[PDB]
Amino acid sequence: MTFITKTPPAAVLLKKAAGIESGSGEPNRNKVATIKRDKVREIAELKMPDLNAASIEAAMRMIEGTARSMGIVVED
């Protein structure tokens, strides 16, 4: 289906928003990669038709469980 269909994982694109692309190793203190909700969901919208979800409730869902099991949070 064109040059796509193999969309990436929401753990590599979501963390992108916040800015945790493996900087190098600076776990000083605090800083838990916070991803606003108006942004995390936005990404789920771009892959909405690539995740096979019927609506955001189905997409943003994988973005909350996928953007949390890694350590990132979400500000509703």
mmJSON file of the N, C-alpha and C atoms, coordinates in Angstrom:
{"data_MODEL":{"atom_site":{
"group_PDB":["ATOM","ATOM","ATOM","ATOM","ATOM","ATOM","ATOM","ATOM","ATOM","ATOM","ATOM","ATOM","ATOM","ATOM","ATOM","ATOM","ATOM","ATOM","ATOM","ATOM","ATOM","ATOM","ATOM","ATOM","ATOM","ATOM","ATOM","ATOM","ATOM","ATOM","ATOM","ATOM","ATOM","ATOM","ATOM","ATOM","ATOM","ATOM","ATOM","ATOM","ATOM","ATOM","ATOM","ATOM","ATOM","ATOM","ATOM","ATOM","ATOM","ATOM","ATOM","ATOM","ATOM","ATOM","ATOM","ATOM","ATOM","ATOM","ATOM","ATOM","ATOM","ATOM","ATOM","ATOM","ATOM","ATOM","ATOM","ATOM","ATOM","ATOM","ATOM","ATOM","ATOM","ATOM","ATOM","ATOM","ATOM","ATOM","ATOM","ATOM","ATOM","ATOM","ATOM","ATOM","ATOM","ATOM","ATOM","ATOM","ATOM","ATOM","ATOM","ATOM","ATOM","ATOM","ATOM","ATOM","ATOM","ATOM","ATOM","ATOM","ATOM","ATOM","ATOM","ATOM","ATOM","ATOM","ATOM","ATOM","ATOM","ATOM","ATOM","ATOM","ATOM","ATOM","ATOM","ATOM","ATOM","ATOM","ATOM","ATOM","ATOM","ATOM","ATOM","ATOM","ATOM","ATOM","ATOM","ATOM","ATOM","ATOM","ATOM","ATOM","ATOM","ATOM","ATOM","ATOM","ATOM","ATOM","ATOM","ATOM","ATOM","ATOM","ATOM","ATOM","ATOM","ATOM","ATOM","ATOM","ATOM","ATOM","ATOM","ATOM","ATOM","ATOM","ATOM","ATOM","ATOM","ATOM","ATOM","ATOM","ATOM","ATOM","ATOM","ATOM","ATOM","ATOM","ATOM","ATOM","ATOM","ATOM","ATOM","ATOM","ATOM","ATOM","ATOM","ATOM","ATOM","ATOM","ATOM","ATOM","ATOM","ATOM","ATOM","ATOM","ATOM","ATOM","ATOM","ATOM","ATOM","ATOM","ATOM","ATOM","ATOM","ATOM","ATOM","ATOM","ATOM","ATOM","ATOM","ATOM","ATOM","ATOM","ATOM","ATOM","ATOM","ATOM","ATOM","ATOM","ATOM","ATOM","ATOM","ATOM","ATOM","ATOM","ATOM","ATOM","ATOM","ATOM","ATOM","ATOM","ATOM","ATOM","ATOM","ATOM","ATOM","ATOM","ATOM","ATOM"],
"id":[1,2,3,4,5,6,7,8,9,10,11,12,13,14,15,16,17,18,19,20,21,22,23,24,25,26,27,28,29,30,31,32,33,34,35,36,37,38,39,40,41,42,43,44,45,46,47,48,49,50,51,52,53,54,55,56,57,58,59,60,61,62,63,64,65,66,67,68,69,70,71,72,73,74,75,76,77,78,79,80,81,82,83,84,85,86,87,88,89,90,91,92,93,94,95,96,97,98,99,100,101,102,103,104,105,106,107,108,109,110,111,112,113,114,115,116,117,118,119,120,121,122,123,124,125,126,127,128,129,130,131,132,133,134,135,136,137,138,139,140,141,142,143,144,145,146,147,148,149,150,151,152,153,154,155,156,157,158,159,160,161,162,163,164,165,166,167,168,169,170,171,172,173,174,175,176,177,178,179,180,181,182,183,184,185,186,187,188,189,190,191,192,193,194,195,196,197,198,199,200,201,202,203,204,205,206,207,208,209,210,211,212,213,214,215,216,217,218,219,220,221,222,223,224,225,226,227,228],
"type_symbol":["N","C","C","N","C","C","N","C","C","N","C","C","N","C","C","N","C","C","N","C","C","N","C","C","N","C","C","N","C","C","N","C","C","N","C","C","N","C","C","N","C","C","N","C","C","N","C","C","N","C","C","N","C","C","N","C","C","N","C","C","N","C","C","N","C","C","N","C","C","N","C","C","N","C","C","N","C","C","N","C","C","N","C","C","N","C","C","N","C","C","N","C","C","N","C","C","N","C","C","N","C","C","N","C","C","N","C","C","N","C","C","N","C","C","N","C","C","N","C","C","N","C","C","N","C","C","N","C","C","N","C","C","N","C","C","N","C","C","N","C","C","N","C","C","N","C","C","N","C","C","N","C","C","N","C","C","N","C","C","N","C","C","N","C","C","N","C","C","N","C","C","N","C","C","N","C","C","N","C","C","N","C","C","N","C","C","N","C","C","N","C","C","N","C","C","N","C","C","N","C","C","N","C","C","N","C","C","N","C","C","N","C","C","N","C","C","N","C","C","N","C","C","N","C","C","N","C","C"],
"label_atom_id":["N","CA","C","N","CA","C","N","CA","C","N","CA","C","N","CA","C","N","CA","C","N","CA","C","N","CA","C","N","CA","C","N","CA","C","N","CA","C","N","CA","C","N","CA","C","N","CA","C","N","CA","C","N","CA","C","N","CA","C","N","CA","C","N","CA","C","N","CA","C","N","CA","C","N","CA","C","N","CA","C","N","CA","C","N","CA","C","N","CA","C","N","CA","C","N","CA","C","N","CA","C","N","CA","C","N","CA","C","N","CA","C","N","CA","C","N","CA","C","N","CA","C","N","CA","C","N","CA","C","N","CA","C","N","CA","C","N","CA","C","N","CA","C","N","CA","C","N","CA","C","N","CA","C","N","CA","C","N","CA","C","N","CA","C","N","CA","C","N","CA","C","N","CA","C","N","CA","C","N","CA","C","N","CA","C","N","CA","C","N","CA","C","N","CA","C","N","CA","C","N","CA","C","N","CA","C","N","CA","C","N","CA","C","N","CA","C","N","CA","C","N","CA","C","N","CA","C","N","CA","C","N","CA","C","N","CA","C","N","CA","C","N","CA","C","N","CA","C","N","CA","C","N","CA","C","N","CA","C","N","CA","C","N","CA","C"],
"label_alt_id":[null,null,null,null,null,null,null,null,null,null,null,null,null,null,null,null,null,null,null,null,null,null,null,null,null,null,null,null,null,null,null,null,null,null,null,null,null,null,null,null,null,null,null,null,null,null,null,null,null,null,null,null,null,null,null,null,null,null,null,null,null,null,null,null,null,null,null,null,null,null,null,null,null,null,null,null,null,null,null,null,null,null,null,null,null,null,null,null,null,null,null,null,null,null,null,null,null,null,null,null,null,null,null,null,null,null,null,null,null,null,null,null,null,null,null,null,null,null,null,null,null,null,null,null,null,null,null,null,null,null,null,null,null,null,null,null,null,null,null,null,null,null,null,null,null,null,null,null,null,null,null,null,null,null,null,null,null,null,null,null,null,null,null,null,null,null,null,null,null,null,null,null,null,null,null,null,null,null,null,null,null,null,null,null,null,null,null,null,null,null,null,null,null,null,null,null,null,null,null,null,null,null,null,null,null,null,null,null,null,null,null,null,null,null,null,null,null,null,null,null,null,null,null,null,null,null,null,null],
"label_comp_id":["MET","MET","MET","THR","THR","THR","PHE","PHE","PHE","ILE","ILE","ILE","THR","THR","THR","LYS","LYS","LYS","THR","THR","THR","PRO","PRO","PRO","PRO","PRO","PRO","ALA","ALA","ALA","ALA","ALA","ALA","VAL","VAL","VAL","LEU","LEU","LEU","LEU","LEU","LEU","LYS","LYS","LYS","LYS","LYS","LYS","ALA","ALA","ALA","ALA","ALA","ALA","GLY","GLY","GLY","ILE","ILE","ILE","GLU","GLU","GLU","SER","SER","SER","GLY","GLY","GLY","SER","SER","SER","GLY","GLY","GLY","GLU","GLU","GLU","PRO","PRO","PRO","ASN","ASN","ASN","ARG","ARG","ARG","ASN","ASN","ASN","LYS","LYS","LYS","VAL","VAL","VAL","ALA","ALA","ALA","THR","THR","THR","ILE","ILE","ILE","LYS","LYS","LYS","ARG","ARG","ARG","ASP","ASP","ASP","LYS","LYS","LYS","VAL","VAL","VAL","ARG","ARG","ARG","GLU","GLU","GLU","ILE","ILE","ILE","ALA","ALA","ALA","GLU","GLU","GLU","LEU","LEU","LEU","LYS","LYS","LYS","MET","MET","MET","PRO","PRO","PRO","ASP","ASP","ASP","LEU","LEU","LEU","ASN","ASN","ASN","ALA","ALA","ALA","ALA","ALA","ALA","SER","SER","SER","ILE","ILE","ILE","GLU","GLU","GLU","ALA","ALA","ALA","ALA","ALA","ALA","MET","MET","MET","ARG","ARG","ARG","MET","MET","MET","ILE","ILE","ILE","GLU","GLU","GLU","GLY","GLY","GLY","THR","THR","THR","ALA","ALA","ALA","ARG","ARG","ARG","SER","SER","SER","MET","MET","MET","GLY","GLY","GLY","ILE","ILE","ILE","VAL","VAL","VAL","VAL","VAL","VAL","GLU","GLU","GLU","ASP","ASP","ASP"],
"label_asym_id":["A","A","A","A","A","A","A","A","A","A","A","A","A","A","A","A","A","A","A","A","A","A","A","A","A","A","A","A","A","A","A","A","A","A","A","A","A","A","A","A","A","A","A","A","A","A","A","A","A","A","A","A","A","A","A","A","A","A","A","A","A","A","A","A","A","A","A","A","A","A","A","A","A","A","A","A","A","A","A","A","A","A","A","A","A","A","A","A","A","A","A","A","A","A","A","A","A","A","A","A","A","A","A","A","A","A","A","A","A","A","A","A","A","A","A","A","A","A","A","A","A","A","A","A","A","A","A","A","A","A","A","A","A","A","A","A","A","A","A","A","A","A","A","A","A","A","A","A","A","A","A","A","A","A","A","A","A","A","A","A","A","A","A","A","A","A","A","A","A","A","A","A","A","A","A","A","A","A","A","A","A","A","A","A","A","A","A","A","A","A","A","A","A","A","A","A","A","A","A","A","A","A","A","A","A","A","A","A","A","A","A","A","A","A","A","A","A","A","A","A","A","A","A","A","A","A","A","A"],
"label_entity_id":["1","1","1","1","1","1","1","1","1","1","1","1","1","1","1","1","1","1","1","1","1","1","1","1","1","1","1","1","1","1","1","1","1","1","1","1","1","1","1","1","1","1","1","1","1","1","1","1","1","1","1","1","1","1","1","1","1","1","1","1","1","1","1","1","1","1","1","1","1","1","1","1","1","1","1","1","1","1","1","1","1","1","1","1","1","1","1","1","1","1","1","1","1","1","1","1","1","1","1","1","1","1","1","1","1","1","1","1","1","1","1","1","1","1","1","1","1","1","1","1","1","1","1","1","1","1","1","1","1","1","1","1","1","1","1","1","1","1","1","1","1","1","1","1","1","1","1","1","1","1","1","1","1","1","1","1","1","1","1","1","1","1","1","1","1","1","1","1","1","1","1","1","1","1","1","1","1","1","1","1","1","1","1","1","1","1","1","1","1","1","1","1","1","1","1","1","1","1","1","1","1","1","1","1","1","1","1","1","1","1","1","1","1","1","1","1","1","1","1","1","1","1","1","1","1","1","1","1"],
"label_seq_id":[1,1,1,2,2,2,3,3,3,4,4,4,5,5,5,6,6,6,7,7,7,8,8,8,9,9,9,10,10,10,11,11,11,12,12,12,13,13,13,14,14,14,15,15,15,16,16,16,17,17,17,18,18,18,19,19,19,20,20,20,21,21,21,22,22,22,23,23,23,24,24,24,25,25,25,26,26,26,27,27,27,28,28,28,29,29,29,30,30,30,31,31,31,32,32,32,33,33,33,34,34,34,35,35,35,36,36,36,37,37,37,38,38,38,39,39,39,40,40,40,41,41,41,42,42,42,43,43,43,44,44,44,45,45,45,46,46,46,47,47,47,48,48,48,49,49,49,50,50,50,51,51,51,52,52,52,53,53,53,54,54,54,55,55,55,56,56,56,57,57,57,58,58,58,59,59,59,60,60,60,61,61,61,62,62,62,63,63,63,64,64,64,65,65,65,66,66,66,67,67,67,68,68,68,69,69,69,70,70,70,71,71,71,72,72,72,73,73,73,74,74,74,75,75,75,76,76,76],
"pdbx_PDB_ins_code":[null,null,null,null,null,null,null,null,null,null,null,null,null,null,null,null,null,null,null,null,null,null,null,null,null,null,null,null,null,null,null,null,null,null,null,null,null,null,null,null,null,null,null,null,null,null,null,null,null,null,null,null,null,null,null,null,null,null,null,null,null,null,null,null,null,null,null,null,null,null,null,null,null,null,null,null,null,null,null,null,null,null,null,null,null,null,null,null,null,null,null,null,null,null,null,null,null,null,null,null,null,null,null,null,null,null,null,null,null,null,null,null,null,null,null,null,null,null,null,null,null,null,null,null,null,null,null,null,null,null,null,null,null,null,null,null,null,null,null,null,null,null,null,null,null,null,null,null,null,null,null,null,null,null,null,null,null,null,null,null,null,null,null,null,null,null,null,null,null,null,null,null,null,null,null,null,null,null,null,null,null,null,null,null,null,null,null,null,null,null,null,null,null,null,null,null,null,null,null,null,null,null,null,null,null,null,null,null,null,null,null,null,null,null,null,null,null,null,null,null,null,null,null,null,null,null,null,null],
"Cartn_x":[0.861,0.0,0.885,1.562,2.447,3.756,4.499,5.789,5.573,4.634,4.385,3.724,2.819,2.121,2.953,4.25,5.104,5.341,4.325,4.476,5.335,6.034,6.911,6.079,6.741,6.089,5.784,4.756,4.407,5.435,6.366,7.394,8.586,8.654,9.79,9.322,8.068,7.552,7.036,6.349,5.824,6.995,7.907,9.075,9.7,9.497,10.078,9.533,8.24,7.647,8.393,8.238,8.936,10.384,11.154,12.573,13.493,13.095,13.949,14.453,15.112,15.627,16.996,17.129,18.437,19.503,19.316,20.316,21.728,22.037,23.397,23.525,22.845,22.93,23.042,21.979,22.028,20.818,20.771,19.679,19.912,20.326,20.575,19.447,18.431,17.305,16.031,14.888,13.613,13.578,12.659,12.577,12.088,10.798,10.261,9.632,10.202,9.641,8.128,7.7,6.237,5.708,4.671,4.114,2.677,2.459,1.079,0.103,-1.167,-2.168,-2.515,-2.565,-2.896,-1.799,-0.691,0.413,0.472,0.57,0.632,-0.51,-1.708,-2.86,-2.602,-2.149,-1.877,-1.105,-0.036,0.756,-0.154,-0.958,-1.871,-2.782,-3.059,-3.94,-3.191,-1.929,-1.146,-1.098,-1.003,-0.954,-2.334,-3.349,-4.721,-5.071,-4.918,-5.217,-4.082,-3.035,-1.9,-1.914,-2.704,-2.765,-4.0,-4.864,-6.087,-7.069,-7.135,-8.073,-9.355,-10.463,-11.745,-11.865,-11.298,-11.382,-10.21,-10.14,-9.023,-9.059,-10.209,-10.305,-9.518,-9.412,-8.654,-7.188,-6.936,-5.526,-4.883,-5.334,-4.748,-4.58,-5.389,-5.271,-3.886,-3.502,-2.161,-1.077,-1.412,-0.404,-0.25,-1.275,-1.175,-0.491,-0.851,-0.217,1.176,1.373,2.71,3.594,3.004,3.81,3.938,3.636,3.739,4.594,4.43,5.234,6.719,7.029,8.46,8.966,8.081,8.516,7.975,7.464,6.922,5.51,5.124,3.758,2.913,1.699,0.842,-0.002,0.043,-0.753,-2.1,-3.12,-4.461,-4.737],
"Cartn_y":[-1.216,0.0,1.25,1.505,2.705,2.434,3.461,3.258,3.382,2.655,2.731,1.43,1.52,0.305,-0.309,-0.185,-0.751,0.325,1.08,2.16,1.662,2.584,2.286,2.128,1.768,1.575,2.928,2.993,4.282,4.597,3.711,3.965,4.692,4.731,5.424,6.783,6.897,8.197,9.035,8.422,9.186,9.815,9.012,9.566,10.696,10.685,11.756,13.116,13.23,14.528,15.052,14.401,14.863,15.227,14.278,14.573,13.561,12.319,11.287,10.3,10.787,9.874,9.332,8.915,8.378,9.47,10.562,11.665,11.083,10.407,9.814,9.147,9.662,9.057,10.165,10.888,11.983,11.881,10.812,10.56,11.346,12.581,13.391,13.162,13.979,13.807,14.412,13.96,14.51,14.321,14.963,14.818,13.411,13.217,11.87,11.907,12.668,12.749,12.965,14.187,14.458,14.79,14.122,14.404,14.909,16.175,16.723,15.781,15.925,15.042,15.619,16.918,17.548,17.217,16.699,16.355,14.837,14.101,12.617,12.135,12.589,12.162,12.565,13.769,14.216,13.121,12.646,11.575,10.379,9.994,8.836,9.123,10.372,10.719,10.46,10.785,10.556,9.057,8.24,6.768,6.165,6.983,6.462,5.378,5.71,4.78,3.764,3.902,2.944,2.0,2.303,1.422,0.523,0.779,-0.061,0.279,1.523,1.917,2.489,2.332,2.866,4.353,4.766,6.203,6.554,7.779,8.181,7.327,7.19,6.368,5.071,4.613,3.357,3.695,4.798,5.182,5.775,6.924,7.552,6.49,5.465,4.399,3.76,3.33,2.7,3.747,5.002,6.073,6.29,6.02,6.211,4.993,3.815,2.59,2.413,2.886,2.75,3.926,5.061,6.243,6.257,5.157,5.102,3.901,2.79,1.585,1.875,2.941,3.276,4.212,4.926,5.856,7.258,7.481,8.828,8.966,10.156,10.351,11.144,11.469,12.237,13.25,14.499,15.528,15.725,15.05,15.197,16.675],
"Cartn_z":[0.0,0.0,0.0,-1.089,-1.171,-0.412,-0.096,0.628,2.141,2.685,4.155,4.625,5.567,6.104,7.234,7.171,8.253,9.311,9.631,10.647,11.815,12.43,13.576,14.853,15.924,17.231,17.883,18.684,19.345,20.435,20.664,21.712,21.087,19.785,19.119,18.595,18.248,17.734,18.906,19.829,20.995,21.75,22.225,22.964,22.142,20.853,19.996,20.438,20.574,21.001,22.231,23.352,24.584,24.245,23.788,23.44,24.125,24.172,24.825,23.77,22.754,21.696,22.113,23.342,23.809,23.703,24.394,24.333,24.42,25.491,25.632,27.003,27.99,29.348,30.396,30.623,31.632,32.566,33.322,34.281,35.578,35.474,36.7,37.708,37.674,38.634,38.041,38.481,37.942,36.424,35.757,34.277,33.928,33.877,33.542,32.147,31.252,29.874,29.948,30.114,30.19,28.795,28.368,27.015,27.147,26.92,27.031,26.327,26.587,25.93,24.559,24.454,23.148,22.133,22.589,21.651,21.465,22.538,22.418,21.514,21.768,20.926,19.474,19.253,17.859,17.12,17.696,17.028,16.743,17.698,17.481,16.286,16.027,14.878,13.568,13.523,12.276,11.974,12.987,12.757,13.027,13.069,13.328,12.301,11.043,9.939,9.774,10.541,10.43,11.633,12.627,13.827,13.736,12.791,12.652,13.775,14.163,15.252,14.641,15.312,14.77,15.113,16.213,16.6,17.52,17.966,18.866,20.134,20.736,21.973,21.778,20.56,20.299,20.024,19.373,19.075,20.33,20.753,21.97,23.058,23.032,24.064,23.977,22.809,22.65,22.92,22.792,23.041,24.547,25.307,26.781,27.404,26.974,27.539,26.934,25.733,25.09,25.508,25.765,26.179,27.704,28.342,29.828,30.234,29.568,29.919,29.695,29.008,28.756,29.855,30.496,31.578,31.297,30.117,29.784,30.358,30.729,31.29,30.286,30.634,29.691,30.478,30.097,30.826,30.128,30.587,29.952,29.67],
"occupancy":[1.0,1.0,1.0,1.0,1.0,1.0,1.0,1.0,1.0,1.0,1.0,1.0,1.0,1.0,1.0,1.0,1.0,1.0,1.0,1.0,1.0,1.0,1.0,1.0,1.0,1.0,1.0,1.0,1.0,1.0,1.0,1.0,1.0,1.0,1.0,1.0,1.0,1.0,1.0,1.0,1.0,1.0,1.0,1.0,1.0,1.0,1.0,1.0,1.0,1.0,1.0,1.0,1.0,1.0,1.0,1.0,1.0,1.0,1.0,1.0,1.0,1.0,1.0,1.0,1.0,1.0,1.0,1.0,1.0,1.0,1.0,1.0,1.0,1.0,1.0,1.0,1.0,1.0,1.0,1.0,1.0,1.0,1.0,1.0,1.0,1.0,1.0,1.0,1.0,1.0,1.0,1.0,1.0,1.0,1.0,1.0,1.0,1.0,1.0,1.0,1.0,1.0,1.0,1.0,1.0,1.0,1.0,1.0,1.0,1.0,1.0,1.0,1.0,1.0,1.0,1.0,1.0,1.0,1.0,1.0,1.0,1.0,1.0,1.0,1.0,1.0,1.0,1.0,1.0,1.0,1.0,1.0,1.0,1.0,1.0,1.0,1.0,1.0,1.0,1.0,1.0,1.0,1.0,1.0,1.0,1.0,1.0,1.0,1.0,1.0,1.0,1.0,1.0,1.0,1.0,1.0,1.0,1.0,1.0,1.0,1.0,1.0,1.0,1.0,1.0,1.0,1.0,1.0,1.0,1.0,1.0,1.0,1.0,1.0,1.0,1.0,1.0,1.0,1.0,1.0,1.0,1.0,1.0,1.0,1.0,1.0,1.0,1.0,1.0,1.0,1.0,1.0,1.0,1.0,1.0,1.0,1.0,1.0,1.0,1.0,1.0,1.0,1.0,1.0,1.0,1.0,1.0,1.0,1.0,1.0,1.0,1.0,1.0,1.0,1.0,1.0,1.0,1.0,1.0,1.0,1.0,1.0,1.0,1.0,1.0,1.0,1.0,1.0],
"B_iso_or_equiv":[0.0,0.0,0.0,0.0,0.0,0.0,0.0,0.0,0.0,0.0,0.0,0.0,0.0,0.0,0.0,0.0,0.0,0.0,0.0,0.0,0.0,0.0,0.0,0.0,0.0,0.0,0.0,0.0,0.0,0.0,0.0,0.0,0.0,0.0,0.0,0.0,0.0,0.0,0.0,0.0,0.0,0.0,0.0,0.0,0.0,0.0,0.0,0.0,0.0,0.0,0.0,0.0,0.0,0.0,0.0,0.0,0.0,0.0,0.0,0.0,0.0,0.0,0.0,0.0,0.0,0.0,0.0,0.0,0.0,0.0,0.0,0.0,0.0,0.0,0.0,0.0,0.0,0.0,0.0,0.0,0.0,0.0,0.0,0.0,0.0,0.0,0.0,0.0,0.0,0.0,0.0,0.0,0.0,0.0,0.0,0.0,0.0,0.0,0.0,0.0,0.0,0.0,0.0,0.0,0.0,0.0,0.0,0.0,0.0,0.0,0.0,0.0,0.0,0.0,0.0,0.0,0.0,0.0,0.0,0.0,0.0,0.0,0.0,0.0,0.0,0.0,0.0,0.0,0.0,0.0,0.0,0.0,0.0,0.0,0.0,0.0,0.0,0.0,0.0,0.0,0.0,0.0,0.0,0.0,0.0,0.0,0.0,0.0,0.0,0.0,0.0,0.0,0.0,0.0,0.0,0.0,0.0,0.0,0.0,0.0,0.0,0.0,0.0,0.0,0.0,0.0,0.0,0.0,0.0,0.0,0.0,0.0,0.0,0.0,0.0,0.0,0.0,0.0,0.0,0.0,0.0,0.0,0.0,0.0,0.0,0.0,0.0,0.0,0.0,0.0,0.0,0.0,0.0,0.0,0.0,0.0,0.0,0.0,0.0,0.0,0.0,0.0,0.0,0.0,0.0,0.0,0.0,0.0,0.0,0.0,0.0,0.0,0.0,0.0,0.0,0.0,0.0,0.0,0.0,0.0,0.0,0.0,0.0,0.0,0.0,0.0,0.0,0.0],
"pdbx_formal_charge":[null,null,null,null,null,null,null,null,null,null,null,null,null,null,null,null,null,null,null,null,null,null,null,null,null,null,null,null,null,null,null,null,null,null,null,null,null,null,null,null,null,null,null,null,null,null,null,null,null,null,null,null,null,null,null,null,null,null,null,null,null,null,null,null,null,null,null,null,null,null,null,null,null,null,null,null,null,null,null,null,null,null,null,null,null,null,null,null,null,null,null,null,null,null,null,null,null,null,null,null,null,null,null,null,null,null,null,null,null,null,null,null,null,null,null,null,null,null,null,null,null,null,null,null,null,null,null,null,null,null,null,null,null,null,null,null,null,null,null,null,null,null,null,null,null,null,null,null,null,null,null,null,null,null,null,null,null,null,null,null,null,null,null,null,null,null,null,null,null,null,null,null,null,null,null,null,null,null,null,null,null,null,null,null,null,null,null,null,null,null,null,null,null,null,null,null,null,null,null,null,null,null,null,null,null,null,null,null,null,null,null,null,null,null,null,null,null,null,null,null,null,null,null,null,null,null,null,null],
"auth_seq_id":[1,1,1,2,2,2,3,3,3,4,4,4,5,5,5,6,6,6,7,7,7,8,8,8,9,9,9,10,10,10,11,11,11,12,12,12,13,13,13,14,14,14,15,15,15,16,16,16,17,17,17,18,18,18,19,19,19,20,20,20,21,21,21,22,22,22,23,23,23,24,24,24,25,25,25,26,26,26,27,27,27,28,28,28,29,29,29,30,30,30,31,31,31,32,32,32,33,33,33,34,34,34,35,35,35,36,36,36,37,37,37,38,38,38,39,39,39,40,40,40,41,41,41,42,42,42,43,43,43,44,44,44,45,45,45,46,46,46,47,47,47,48,48,48,49,49,49,50,50,50,51,51,51,52,52,52,53,53,53,54,54,54,55,55,55,56,56,56,57,57,57,58,58,58,59,59,59,60,60,60,61,61,61,62,62,62,63,63,63,64,64,64,65,65,65,66,66,66,67,67,67,68,68,68,69,69,69,70,70,70,71,71,71,72,72,72,73,73,73,74,74,74,75,75,75,76,76,76],
"auth_comp_id":["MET","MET","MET","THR","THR","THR","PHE","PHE","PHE","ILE","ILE","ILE","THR","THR","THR","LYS","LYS","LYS","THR","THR","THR","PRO","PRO","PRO","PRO","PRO","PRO","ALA","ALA","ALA","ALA","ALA","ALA","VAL","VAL","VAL","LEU","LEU","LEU","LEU","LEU","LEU","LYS","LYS","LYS","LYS","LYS","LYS","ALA","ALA","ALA","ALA","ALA","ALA","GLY","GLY","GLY","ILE","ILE","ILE","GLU","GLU","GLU","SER","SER","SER","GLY","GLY","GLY","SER","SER","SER","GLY","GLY","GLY","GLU","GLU","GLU","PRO","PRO","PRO","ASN","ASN","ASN","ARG","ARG","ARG","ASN","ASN","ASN","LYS","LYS","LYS","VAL","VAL","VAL","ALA","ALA","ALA","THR","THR","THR","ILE","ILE","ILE","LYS","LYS","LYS","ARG","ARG","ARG","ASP","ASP","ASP","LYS","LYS","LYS","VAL","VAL","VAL","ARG","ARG","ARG","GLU","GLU","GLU","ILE","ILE","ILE","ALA","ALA","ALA","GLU","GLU","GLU","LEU","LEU","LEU","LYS","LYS","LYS","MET","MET","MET","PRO","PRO","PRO","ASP","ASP","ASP","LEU","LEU","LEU","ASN","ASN","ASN","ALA","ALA","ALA","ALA","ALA","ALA","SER","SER","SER","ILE","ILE","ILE","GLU","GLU","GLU","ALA","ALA","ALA","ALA","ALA","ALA","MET","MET","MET","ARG","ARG","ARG","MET","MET","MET","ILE","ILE","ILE","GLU","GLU","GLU","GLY","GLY","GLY","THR","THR","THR","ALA","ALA","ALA","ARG","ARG","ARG","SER","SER","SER","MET","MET","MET","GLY","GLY","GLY","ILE","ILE","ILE","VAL","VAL","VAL","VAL","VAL","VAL","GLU","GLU","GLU","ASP","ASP","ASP"],
"auth_asym_id":["A","A","A","A","A","A","A","A","A","A","A","A","A","A","A","A","A","A","A","A","A","A","A","A","A","A","A","A","A","A","A","A","A","A","A","A","A","A","A","A","A","A","A","A","A","A","A","A","A","A","A","A","A","A","A","A","A","A","A","A","A","A","A","A","A","A","A","A","A","A","A","A","A","A","A","A","A","A","A","A","A","A","A","A","A","A","A","A","A","A","A","A","A","A","A","A","A","A","A","A","A","A","A","A","A","A","A","A","A","A","A","A","A","A","A","A","A","A","A","A","A","A","A","A","A","A","A","A","A","A","A","A","A","A","A","A","A","A","A","A","A","A","A","A","A","A","A","A","A","A","A","A","A","A","A","A","A","A","A","A","A","A","A","A","A","A","A","A","A","A","A","A","A","A","A","A","A","A","A","A","A","A","A","A","A","A","A","A","A","A","A","A","A","A","A","A","A","A","A","A","A","A","A","A","A","A","A","A","A","A","A","A","A","A","A","A","A","A","A","A","A","A","A","A","A","A","A","A"],
"auth_atom_id":["N","CA","C","N","CA","C","N","CA","C","N","CA","C","N","CA","C","N","CA","C","N","CA","C","N","CA","C","N","CA","C","N","CA","C","N","CA","C","N","CA","C","N","CA","C","N","CA","C","N","CA","C","N","CA","C","N","CA","C","N","CA","C","N","CA","C","N","CA","C","N","CA","C","N","CA","C","N","CA","C","N","CA","C","N","CA","C","N","CA","C","N","CA","C","N","CA","C","N","CA","C","N","CA","C","N","CA","C","N","CA","C","N","CA","C","N","CA","C","N","CA","C","N","CA","C","N","CA","C","N","CA","C","N","CA","C","N","CA","C","N","CA","C","N","CA","C","N","CA","C","N","CA","C","N","CA","C","N","CA","C","N","CA","C","N","CA","C","N","CA","C","N","CA","C","N","CA","C","N","CA","C","N","CA","C","N","CA","C","N","CA","C","N","CA","C","N","CA","C","N","CA","C","N","CA","C","N","CA","C","N","CA","C","N","CA","C","N","CA","C","N","CA","C","N","CA","C","N","CA","C","N","CA","C","N","CA","C","N","CA","C","N","CA","C","N","CA","C","N","CA","C","N","CA","C","N","CA","C","N","CA","C","N","CA","C"],
"pdbx_PDB_model_num":[1,1,1,1,1,1,1,1,1,1,1,1,1,1,1,1,1,1,1,1,1,1,1,1,1,1,1,1,1,1,1,1,1,1,1,1,1,1,1,1,1,1,1,1,1,1,1,1,1,1,1,1,1,1,1,1,1,1,1,1,1,1,1,1,1,1,1,1,1,1,1,1,1,1,1,1,1,1,1,1,1,1,1,1,1,1,1,1,1,1,1,1,1,1,1,1,1,1,1,1,1,1,1,1,1,1,1,1,1,1,1,1,1,1,1,1,1,1,1,1,1,1,1,1,1,1,1,1,1,1,1,1,1,1,1,1,1,1,1,1,1,1,1,1,1,1,1,1,1,1,1,1,1,1,1,1,1,1,1,1,1,1,1,1,1,1,1,1,1,1,1,1,1,1,1,1,1,1,1,1,1,1,1,1,1,1,1,1,1,1,1,1,1,1,1,1,1,1,1,1,1,1,1,1,1,1,1,1,1,1,1,1,1,1,1,1,1,1,1,1,1,1,1,1,1,1,1,1]
}}}
